[PDB]
Amino acid sequence: EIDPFEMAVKQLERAAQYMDISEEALEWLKKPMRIVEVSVPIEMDDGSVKVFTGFRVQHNWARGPTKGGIRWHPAETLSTVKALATWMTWKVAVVDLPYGGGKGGIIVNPKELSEREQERLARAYIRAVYDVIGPWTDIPAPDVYTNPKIMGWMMDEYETIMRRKGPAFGVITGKPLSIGGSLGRGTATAQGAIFTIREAAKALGIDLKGKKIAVQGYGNAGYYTAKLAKEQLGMTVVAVSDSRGGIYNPDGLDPDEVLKWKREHGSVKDFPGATNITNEELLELEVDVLAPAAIEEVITEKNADNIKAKIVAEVANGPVTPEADDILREKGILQIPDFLCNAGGVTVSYFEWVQNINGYYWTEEEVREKLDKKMTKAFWEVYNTHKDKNIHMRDAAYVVAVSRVYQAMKDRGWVKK
């Protein structure tokens, strides 16, 4: 049923087919450099002891310490962790961070655990994987069903074990502001998406002031993308959507009022002055920027032709299928690859790690400007590769990331060819 690691390896081979890479380097990149599977025992609230399965996969560390989150899902598998670590490698390589690829996970349903049990689980996971993590070895991060509270617990346990012999704040990112946290973490993904959209408009020669944007999904990423677009880029937000449905208004939407209505009516539907539309119908609107910030695979071969957006900002994690990719490219529409558009979160986590390591913490403006520089440089590199190699933007981003990792490997002497 299309194993995640098989899919990742196929993606890597496809990317290697568009660039000059040696066979030994490809074989090295097809396998994670270190996989750690540990037992995570905790004491239940009823006094019993339960053992959970924890993972920590470090795909590659040629460019520096590995970076990646920890998932707490009942359906976690070592294959999924390996695939996500492989993808995290390219995610940190495309935006030029001194990081490798890493990922963790515990096979547990956190909906049935109390606060004390969750804290015990985090501390036991740290005790189990201490020997393969560190400020300069492996930096975990929040992921699905994991939050900054668990980050604080993990950091505290790591500091307790390490005996405060170094920057224990920098061992993990996504921490609360009170303990080594960073500013701008809430709006990192949306800010990166906005910078990439601005650069794409600059590349296409389109002035965004007075244009239209449609956003699918109105969670944290979608709402902040719409709000930041309207604020900075001056783009008129004409359509937003949630799981229940979507709304449309050619005169424009106010993101704050829409958020208030969603937080009051439980959904964005039936917003005053707005016409109710379906998600599929939102994908059909004639806009200049489309930002899918929702479930995977919303653009398929069926509806790829009927898309009228000039720029498709893949804020979510792969909302466009390869057939849809080819169809959309044929229509002369610029796509911003998913792991380049939403690279703001990992970039801001890197900024947090830098602040923790240095012992000096920045402000909201400094973080915003550094993120702006990083996203602009990454998008311009990807677009230049796209224009030079006459390939898809996703293929160009993969080529850039794999080339950076391959050059780092060659410089270390790991591969001689």
Ligand SMILES: NC(=O)C1=CN([C@@H]2O[C@H](COP(=O)(O)OP(=O)(O)OC[C@H]3O[C@@H](n4cnc5c(N)ncnc54)[C@H](OP(=O)(O)O)[C@@H]3O)[C@@H](O)[C@H]2O)C=CC1
């Ligand atoms: N936000 C972040 O920090 C980062 C985000 N990403 C990626 O970004 C996207 C969104 O992130 P995030 O804000 O955390 O997500 P959220 O869980 O906070 O919100 C999800 C939003 O998308 C909607 N949604 C879920 N399924 C559908 C669907 N089938 N159709 C239409 N709308 C749907 C939800 O609707 P409803 O409210 O009704 O449930 C909600 O509006 C994801 O694809 C994620 O992978 C990854 C990098 C970090």
